[PDB]
Design a protein around this motif. Structure first.
Motif, PDB file in Angstrom:
ATOM      1  N   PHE A  93       0.833  -1.200   0.000  1.00 30.53           N
ATOM      2  CA  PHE A  93       0.000   0.000   0.000  1.00 30.53           C
ATOM      3  C   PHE A  93       0.869   1.251   0.000  1.00 30.53           C
ATOM      4  CE2 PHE A  93      -4.026  -1.952   2.155  1.00 30.53           C
ATOM      5  CZ  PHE A  93      -4.337  -2.568   0.951  1.00 30.53           C
ATOM      6  N   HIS A  94       1.848   1.285   0.894  1.00 29.28           N
ATOM      7  CA  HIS A  94       2.744   2.427   0.991  1.00 29.28           C
ATOM      8  C   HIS A  94       3.493   2.680  -0.331  1.00 29.28           C
ATOM      9  CE1 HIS A  94       6.633   4.386   1.971  1.00 29.28           C
ATOM     10  NE2 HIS A  94       5.846   5.187   2.668  1.00 29.28           N
ATOM     11  N   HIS A  95       4.013   1.612  -0.934  1.00 30.02           N
ATOM     12  CA  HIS A  95       4.718   1.737  -2.211  1.00 30.02           C
ATOM     13  C   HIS A  95       3.841   2.423  -3.247  1.00 30.02           C
ATOM     14  CE1 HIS A  95       7.665  -0.011  -5.364  1.00 30.02           C
ATOM     15  NE2 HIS A  95       6.792   0.733  -6.024  1.00 30.02           N
ATOM     16  N   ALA A  99       5.023   6.099  -4.549  1.00 31.74           N
ATOM     17  CA  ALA A  99       5.413   6.097  -5.945  1.00 31.74           C
ATOM     18  C   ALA A  99       4.493   7.000  -6.755  1.00 31.74           C
ATOM     19  CB  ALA A  99       5.397   4.698  -6.503  1.00 31.74           C
ATOM     20  N   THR A 100       3.192   6.964  -6.458  1.00 34.41           N
ATOM     21  CA  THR A 100       2.211   7.759  -7.201  1.00 34.41           C
ATOM     22  C   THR A 100       2.466   9.250  -6.984  1.00 34.41           C
ATOM     23  OG1 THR A 100       0.479   6.055  -7.053  1.00 34.41           O
ATOM     24  CG2 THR A 100      -0.254   8.274  -7.537  1.00 34.41           C
ATOM     25  N   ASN A 101       2.726   9.604  -5.729  1.00 32.74           N
ATOM     26  CA  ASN A 101       3.116  10.952  -5.372  1.00 32.74           C
ATOM     27  C   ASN A 101       2.190  12.011  -5.974  1.00 32.74           C
ATOM     28  OD1 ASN A 101       4.808  12.757  -4.065  1.00 32.74           O
ATOM     29  ND2 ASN A 101       6.026  13.092  -5.928  1.00 32.74           N
ATOM     30  N   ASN A 102       0.883  11.774  -5.874  1.00 34.72           N
ATOM     31  CA  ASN A 102      -0.119  12.688  -6.435  1.00 34.72           C
ATOM     32  C   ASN A 102      -0.008  12.915  -7.941  1.00 34.72           C
ATOM     33  OD1 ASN A 102       0.483  14.340  -3.380  1.00 34.72           O
ATOM     34  ND2 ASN A 102      -1.329  13.081  -3.817  1.00 34.72           N
ATOM     35  N   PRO A 107      10.116   6.932  -9.496  1.00 37.35           N
ATOM     36  CA  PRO A 107      10.552   5.548  -9.716  1.00 37.35           C
ATOM     37  C   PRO A 107      10.999   4.935  -8.396  1.00 37.35           C
ATOM     38  CG  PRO A 107      11.477   6.980 -11.382  1.00 37.35           C
ATOM     39  CD  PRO A 107      10.896   7.879 -10.313  1.00 37.35           C
ATOM     40  N   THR A 108      10.340   3.865  -7.970  1.00 38.61           N
ATOM     41  CA  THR A 108      10.541   3.299  -6.644  1.00 38.61           C
ATOM     42  C   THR A 108      10.578   1.784  -6.708  1.00 38.61           C
ATOM     43  OG1 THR A 108       9.317   5.151  -5.722  1.00 38.61           O
ATOM     44  CG2 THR A 108       9.588   3.239  -4.277  1.00 38.61           C
ATOM     45  N   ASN A 235       8.572   0.368  -9.902  1.00 40.76           N
ATOM     46  CA  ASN A 235       7.823   1.138 -10.890  1.00 40.76           C
ATOM     47  C   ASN A 235       8.611   2.293 -11.517  1.00 40.76           C
ATOM     48  OD1 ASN A 235       7.332   2.539  -8.147  1.00 40.76           O
ATOM     49  ND2 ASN A 235       6.690   4.080  -9.680  1.00 40.76           N
ATOM     50  N   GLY A 236       8.196   2.682 -12.715  1.00 39.61           N
ATOM     51  CA  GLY A 236       8.603   3.932 -13.330  1.00 39.61           C
ATOM     52  C   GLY A 236       7.313   4.668 -13.670  1.00 39.61           C
TER      53      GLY A 236
END
Ligand code: HEM
Ligand code: HEM
Ligand SMILES: N=C(Nc1cccc(OC[C@@H](O)c2cccc(NC(=N)c3cccs3)c2)c1)c1cccs1
Ligand SMILES: N=C(Nc1cccc(OC[C@@H](O)c2cccc(NC(=N)c3cccs3)c2)c1)c1cccs1
Ligand SMILES: [Cl-]
Ligand SMILES: [Cl-]
Lengths: 362, 362
Positions: A93-95, A99-102, A107-108, A235-236
């Protein structure tokens, strides 16, 4: 016995890694500690630095990836401490959230404990953390065919999809010692989606297309210095063609070209009209337009290829051999308009790297 | 000595060839004649049947060719009897005329005498029998850059181009024993050209684009049963993308995308507009439209890929292994819309076949 293989990869990794980190002097002693740690325990544990840098190196060595210019800015979340399925769930969930960062995608990669005896500690069933379900029965074809078997596996476990064309699959994974995976529905607040609209053609919205913002590959093994991190989702951001030329275009995916042709008002009867090609361009323009309008990170294939050209130049001037897979590096639309098409690449496999592994279902 | 290599290829060819021709019984005696003929003369001469079938086999084995379905209908002109440069010239003129066939292009190959001692009898300097000259001096860039060096070679020999963007290069070749090639201007009545117009966009004609009707590759070696036919020009018809996505599109060729973008009335400022992609589609629609309207044979990449799918099916049911080069088989536009993209191919080299050979100039 097999321990020998670990030690070799360990020597090769630490040397290359500390050399790049300017810690070449620290090698002899770091290797020593590793040698005895392997002797006594059968394995060895990476430092924060080794793990972070290894995940970065792995991305840098991914032959099929056009986005590698930005390898060194990879955000590495170390979650080797998880012991419980609530911890794994919350890590996932946190990832997604960070990663989405609004919409301004970072990339995480989240790294879970590695395989012990080849035995997984955490076994992720999702192919991507965010993906649409797919259904198929009695001629009826709903959703994403790529997800047909995982979807059937989920529904075995008591999950049930709404049978919309865009059902979000639950997170589903198995812990060592559990015979069965658990599944958790995705909180919709975590998942950004983008409605596909066209800048010029107002009727494009009649197709009611959408896609998710962040592709988070959760079924590959990260291998770093002999250590096998089977659970290490990364992700990227998307390159537009992945959505517009494949996910929504392929006959074995969403298969939308005839429909696109209709709303853009061209006939879909003659090959020589290049209606598929024309549909592709408009669908792909639509996708880039929609992500940018929502403020969700995305790159077009031309900009991406220009960036990759810089990666090529950067590797040479750093004295690193470049490796690549021409067949995956060229974009599926207008590939001859990129420099990639007109040169060739050494497809050699260099470690650290990301590898395929067998699905636990089907 | 080296003779051994000829004999081996000869055995392999005759067996496979006569087997396909249903003449398997005739092999033992045909091979015998060949054995002694090699012994006494150093080489051996193909029958009409062997030569015709070998040129057909060679096309069938060309890994990079998407047009192979029609391999068995290749029209083979046997010109091993030429001894003079007037004969060579007239053979080349005739090939152009009969292959063009008033626009209804016949796939044809003209076969000249093979290399003797590795020594060529006829040495063709043209890369294609019909091609445009290219010039480059003082920033000035005129015509086809691909032809820059041959053009400079021709102008050494007293040829002079008009320095139009579409100067037809002369036929140019050298006979064994001559230190210098001769050149002959192409009779314009022999050469079909097609003005590029667009079906919808009337302003497309302002670009004043054109291309020649028939691509006649004249710089490859046909190798059949150990025999090296360095001079053996062949033709098919174009696939549209060869003209629209490469010859007229490439930055190192005619480089027309920005101009296309202008006449089709789209901006060429932003990568995310996919203006190159859009320009490509319209240019490629324009090319197919123009060839069909003039009545000159051409195939689109979708129809071509469908035909190649039949070649694949045909090869399997005939019990022949299929070979191919994925990197040349995929079309340079919308490659993921063809089946070719989604499978892979064995790139093994099987003889008979067409091979590259070194240019005699530059
Ligand atoms: C930053 C934005 C990124 C972009 C735009 C990008 C772009 C792409 C694209 C288009 C592909 C090919 C996928 C396909 O065509 O099917 C790809 C493959 C790949 N990328 Fe990247 N990428 C990015 C970041 C990353 C990151 C962060 C990683 C891991 C740390 C990564 C590792 C890979 C791997 C392993 C593959 C190959 C997967 C396979 O073999 O199936 N990339 N990338
Ligand atoms: C009948 C219509 C034909 C079509 C539409 C066709 C199509 C093509 C195309 C598109 C290519 C790739 C060229 C490129 O992308 O740069 C190609 C390559 C090739 N074709 Fe065909 N072809 C046809 C007939 C023939 C014939 C008659 C021969 C010889 C007998 C032939 C032999 C080859 C060879 C040798 C290559 C590869 C050349 C190289 O390696 O550079 N094709 N064909
Ligand atoms: N593209 C091809 N294969 C293919 C076919 C179907 C699905 C597929 O998914 C890749 C998908 O799993 C995937 C894998 C890795 C990266 C991405 N795309 C992304 N932007 C990222 C996800 C995570 C970090 S970047 C997407 C790849 C071929 C090229 C040439 C012949 S076949
Ligand atoms: N297409 C590529 N290379 C390339 C680059 C520049 C020119 C070129 O000309 C081929 C040209 O000489 C040629 C050769 C053979 C056939 C054709 N086209 C035809 N329709 C025919 C001519 C004669 C019979 S068919 C044309 C090929 C690449 C694909 C992937 C990476 S690079
Ligand atoms: Cl995807
Ligand atoms: Cl050409």
């Amino acid at each position: 016995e097999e321990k020998e293989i670990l030690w070799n990869e360990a020597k090769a990794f630490i040397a290359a890694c500390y050399q790049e980190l300017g810690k070449a002097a620290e090698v002899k002693d770091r290797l020593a500690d590793i040698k005895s740690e392997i002797d006594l325990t059968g394995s060895y544990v990476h430092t924060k630095e080794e793990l972070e840098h290894g995940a970065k190196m792995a991305w840098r060595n991914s032959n099929r990836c056009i986005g590698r210019l930005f390898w060194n800015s990879l955000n590495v979340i170390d979650r080797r401490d998880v012991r419980t399925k609530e911890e794994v769930r919350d890590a996932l969930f946190h990832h997604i959230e960070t990663a989405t960062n609004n919409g301004k995608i970072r990339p995480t990669i989240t790294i879970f404990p590695p395989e012990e005896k080849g035995e997984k500690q955490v076994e992720i069933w999702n192919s991507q953390l965010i993906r649409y379900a797919g259904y198929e029965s009695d001629g009826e074809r709903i959703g994403d065919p790529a997800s047909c078997s995982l979807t059937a596996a989920c529904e075995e476990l008591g999950w049930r999809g709404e049978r919309t064309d865009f059902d979000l699959l639950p997170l589903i994974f198995r812990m060592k010692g559990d015979e069965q995976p658990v599944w958790y529905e995705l909180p919709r607040s975590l998942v950004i989606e983008v409605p596909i609209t066209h800048p010029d053609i107002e009727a494009f919205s009649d197709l009611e297309l959408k896609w998710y913002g962040v592709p988070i590959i959760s079924d590959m093994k990260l291998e770093v210095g002999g250590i096998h991190y089977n659970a290490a989702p990364f992700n990227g951001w998307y390159m537009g063609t992945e959505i517009g030329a494949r996910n929504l275009a392929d006959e074995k995916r969403y298969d939308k070209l005839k429909k696109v042709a209709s709303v853009i008002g061209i006939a879909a009867d003659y090959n020589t009209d290049l209606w598929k090609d024309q549909a592709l361009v408009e669908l792909n323009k639509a996708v880039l337009h929609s992500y940018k309008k929502q403020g969700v990170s995305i790159v077009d294939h031309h900009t991406a290829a220009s960036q990759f050209k810089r990666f090529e130049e950067q590797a040479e001037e750093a004295g690193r051999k470049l490796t690549g897979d021409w067949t995956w590096l060229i974009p599926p639309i207008s590939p001859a308009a990129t420099h990639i098409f007109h040169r060739s690449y050494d497809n050699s496999i260099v470690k650290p790297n990301y590898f395929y592994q067998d699905k636990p279902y089907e």
